[PDB]
Amino acid sequence: KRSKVEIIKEKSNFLRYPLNEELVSAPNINESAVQLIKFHGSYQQTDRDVQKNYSFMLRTKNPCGKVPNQLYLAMDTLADEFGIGTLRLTTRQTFQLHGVLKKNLKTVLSTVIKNMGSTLGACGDLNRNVLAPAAPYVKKDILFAQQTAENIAALLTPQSGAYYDLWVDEEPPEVTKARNDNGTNFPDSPEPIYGTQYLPRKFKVAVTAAGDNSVDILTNDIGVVVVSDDAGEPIGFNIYVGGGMGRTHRVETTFPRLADPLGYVPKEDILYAIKAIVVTQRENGRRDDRKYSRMKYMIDRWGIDRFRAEVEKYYGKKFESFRPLPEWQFNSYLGWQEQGDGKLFYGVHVDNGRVGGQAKKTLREIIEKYNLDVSITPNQNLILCGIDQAWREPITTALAQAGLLEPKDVDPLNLTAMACPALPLCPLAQTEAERGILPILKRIRAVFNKVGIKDSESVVVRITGCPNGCARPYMAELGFVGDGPKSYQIWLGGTPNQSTLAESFMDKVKLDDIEKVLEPLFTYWNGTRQEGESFGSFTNRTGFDKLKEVVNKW
Amino acid sequence: VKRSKVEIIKEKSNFLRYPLNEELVSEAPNINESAVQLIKFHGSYQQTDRDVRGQKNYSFMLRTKNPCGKVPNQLYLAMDTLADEFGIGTLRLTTRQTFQLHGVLKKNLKTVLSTVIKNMGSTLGACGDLNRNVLAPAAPYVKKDILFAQQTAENIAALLTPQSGAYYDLWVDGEKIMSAEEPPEVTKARNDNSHGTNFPDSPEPIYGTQYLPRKFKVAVTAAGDNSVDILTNDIGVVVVSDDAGEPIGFNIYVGGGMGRTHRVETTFPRLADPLGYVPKEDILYAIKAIVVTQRENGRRDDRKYSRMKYMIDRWGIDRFRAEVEKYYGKKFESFRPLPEWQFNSYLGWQEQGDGKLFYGVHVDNGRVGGQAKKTLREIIEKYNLDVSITPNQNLILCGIDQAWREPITTALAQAGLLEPKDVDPLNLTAMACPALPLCPLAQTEAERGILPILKRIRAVFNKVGIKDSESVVVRITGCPNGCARPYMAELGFVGDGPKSYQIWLGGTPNQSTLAESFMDKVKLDDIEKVLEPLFTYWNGTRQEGESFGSFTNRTGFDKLKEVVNKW
Amino acid sequence: ATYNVKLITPEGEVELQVPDDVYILDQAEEDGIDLPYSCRAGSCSSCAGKVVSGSVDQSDQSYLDDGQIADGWVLTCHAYPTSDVVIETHKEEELT
Ligand code: SRM
Ligand code: SRM
Ligand code: SF4
Ligand code: SF4
Ligand code: FES
């Protein structure tokens, strides 16, 4: 018993066939090609506002969210030349570029590859973009987190040259060495770790430094945390395993899950431990029903201790005990900040990561005129890196003129909010997210004002169009998860920190009825919160039973 | 909050008596809504004839309960006479091995049902929010696992028979019976509250005042024999035997159903999951436990989502098994390996295994009328035969002395009934539901449109060059409720408009596979436009002996739609 | 185009946003309003309503003749709204 996608991967000759023929046929491609083109970082979509108008979304690979100047410039131009005029920053520190016609697809990807970029493995049954702290801090543990993420991305990059064959016709030796060691490998294959069948499903890793949870670590297949040493010298990594947001409405055997603490490894061991984890998923882990394929389900089923022992077979030694860590703090990296080396960086707030019409033009003019590298954050924002102090004022002036605001001038709801693209181009969406979130945030602000909550107060709001959870709604203080054309499930219990799993509070709340739920919830928060207690902490301390009583009584 | 109108009706009815009892005897040709809902539980349905455009002409359909499809001689004779005397001159064999008798006037309803009850029959629970007819292998084989499947189905039917006595009170003023004592193992299983299944003080120890959330369907068979279309049922029970053919236990599947509704994608057909295995002595306890789990947990707010299939879809099979295990009082064992399913029609001349023969009579759509009907009744009466109804709407003449083979064969041929060899193979495995004119849920024809469709399928086959011994399972319904189990067809037509069908593909000759919807709103006139390219591509690229069903699943809808659009 | 569809039911007046390519009954259902039906394909009278104002497209139906359509009858299962429309529901027994 194996899924249709397994058979497709099997027959494809490492992701070439029949994609290769289909690419050069019709405005669309066949089902097999649709599945395969994902591994090369593109998705066939249709516009659901319209009557099948086909186009292709493309998604980049950018470990740590780092984007070289040359790539930003090419992406910016490609969006206008061959896309819909926008770049979409994502919750995994990546670009997406929507609306590409099939006849231009090879031109677009080839341009990406020739401009210090890649889409390889941006989708597919393989390692997705590896998260790291987006800020260009010079601090040691931050730099080391960033390097480690890059190493992991490279380690887990597909080695079949299928990508380069279709579209276009440095690596630290530690990575090559780790990749080549025998667990773990298929010694004679074009894919030493992935093999012919790749993974059972997408696989998501996040790396960070102790204390910094910009990366929403608990949500990933593997979370990697740099541990230091009283002087700030990295000595090793704590590891979490088995998080994921993906679930499906009315299928209670599907659920979001928080990664478990797995243990600690010395710094020199990291790539071996990671490969061991990946191989454990590769070998075990369901290929019959995609839906129960993510590593989270294997860990739910086995328990963390049996999983650890299995990983230890491929690692070749015992994980040490997970070391104590500081609390978790969310960091947006927005506004004007010091890198620590004399240069500045500026974090640009972007609602939903949607970079378009003028904001887009101005960003490109800045980036091009000062030759900046940039970085994408897991909250869909853009950091302008490596700024000389002398440039602070003209950059600030240019951004303000374009309508791009400093954090102090943005509603705090917006600063932490996220929504997925959903409609019109997502084929899974049940309702709006990106196109409906801004009016929702304004309504939340109006509920706060009516209730008497100060305009500096806020709550994390994350909206998706369906329960797949691409904006990580199940970590929100307030999550809306689309469950109908004009309705959302409301989730509560996430924290400002992203250290806590939300739970479903109510189903099928109609868009029009949102205030009927929110007003009593926030009235009770205002009325009985402890001093400075967040809505999230207040929700977990007070409990759903009391919150529902309050909602029903209203 | 949140309980359906039918729940409140059951609640107010004093175990299915009130206000049915007073409505039955009112002057009007119909009965009120509450009575309409209640009379189902006594095995009758108020209908109206949709061919007559200007005015509701009321009548009552009646459906029997015949576990395994077994029909005693006395009952066949009574049903045959009732159909002519009080009905519309036909008996309708069904996909659950039952009779239906259409067209009874309200004023004659009690006479008809009473006659059924006095003639070794029953309609109790043939409809309603309860256990429907229990399927078993229809053939009167003397083989042990077949006999045991049949006995088990009967025991289950009896176990899940309503106990209130309301039925006998309304139709027979309370009398009788005579009938067999119910086997004591059934009574014991039913009584028995050692695991909290029952309402100890109630006229309905299992069902209570509310009965089930919805109809509930069980099919029992022997390993290998899928005449019962097992995967489709709430519970599928499979007799497992040792190497010698001695029954040792049962595998159990749970949570199938066909019912869905157009443009409500939260409704769907579903295949039953393997649940596990129980030793043979445990069966009624396991089954009751499954039924009680549905009784306690199925949705009673919205009837569309009440069937057990939804509970299992939602909970998953493991959580469902643990819940059933509370009421069973012990663990299911692991589901044992089974041989591959095979469809059997049981048609033609065969051996029972004891020296007597049986003959399976092919009947298109189970519609027994005019002459075929007359001749069948003459044979059955002359030779005093018991008979059996199959889940493919056919009739088996059982217990035939070898000496009678020739005169029976002569009488049947004279009546225009045919042996399988003289039937188009498309007909042999085809089924349609009654749909129009008497089904209130029908959106188009099924039974009245299927025979011309089969002949047009045959003409597509001939044109394409496919041999006339080749076939595909065709099943047609007038709406998406799926009474002819179309979602298990190689070719299913499911009514979605006055003269249109949704076409479903991917079922297999075996009924081991769930079809998927291929195209919507295919007009009756356009059928060839879809079928010709499909069957051309089947003929052109099938593997040796590969069925249209397996060919469909191997080739995939993407490539089939491309082929259909190119055409 | 989405239209305001007013349904006057025996339990009360309810207001819904029904898109122009969605049947009236199908939206009611989505919004958890209990309306009557049986065939759900326009060939009977279970779902019959009366248009108080506005208009519907119900060409997919086949039961009602034209005098009845002119008289404002509507089969809610097979009607798309073509304007803001006000419809009395549960009106079958006003015929059969
Ligand atoms: C006669 C029979 C069809 C046949 O050609 O043989 C039949 C005929 C009707 N079925 Fe059925 N169903 C018959 C077996 C089935 C089956 C097959 C099976 O059970 O293996 C199914 C699909 C399996 C399932 O239950 O999902 C089936 C799914 C339905 C449904 C949808 C059920 C659901 O739970 O969604 C309805 C409507 C309802 O009850 O909601 C229904 C309702 C009806 C009604 C009674 C319409 C109604 O509710 O008033 C039918 C009357 C037609 C007429 O004028 O005679 N019938 N019905 C069936 C044989 C049954 C028997 O008990 O003796
Ligand atoms: C590709 C698709 C729809 C599809 O399958 O064709 C999709 C599939 C999915 C799907 C559906 C699937 O692929 O099965 C799922 C459910 C996966 C599962 O295992 O259950 C899903 C859970 C997420 C999750 C939850 C974590 C997880 O995987 O559980 C995350 C977050 C994370 O990784 O931290 C996520 C990160 C994005 N996901 Fe996602 N995701 C889509 C957008 C995104 C991006 C662009 C959202 C954003 O607002 O930033 C994502 C940013 C990520 C990136 O570049 O890699 C999206 C396209 C929408 C469009 O029109 O562009 N997706 N996406
Ligand atoms: S969460 Fe759902 S709707 Fe949103 S982008 Fe992901 S798949 Fe689409
Ligand atoms: S499938 Fe539909 S039309 Fe056919 S008998 Fe059943 S309910 Fe009636
Ligand atoms: S329900 Fe039959 S016409 Fe609408």
Ligand SMILES: [Cl-]
């Ligand atoms: Cl994704």
Ligand SMILES: [Cl-]
């Ligand atoms: Cl039925």
Ligand SMILES: [Mg+2]
């Ligand atoms: Mg943002």
Ligand SMILES: [Mg+2]
């Ligand atoms: Mg037949």
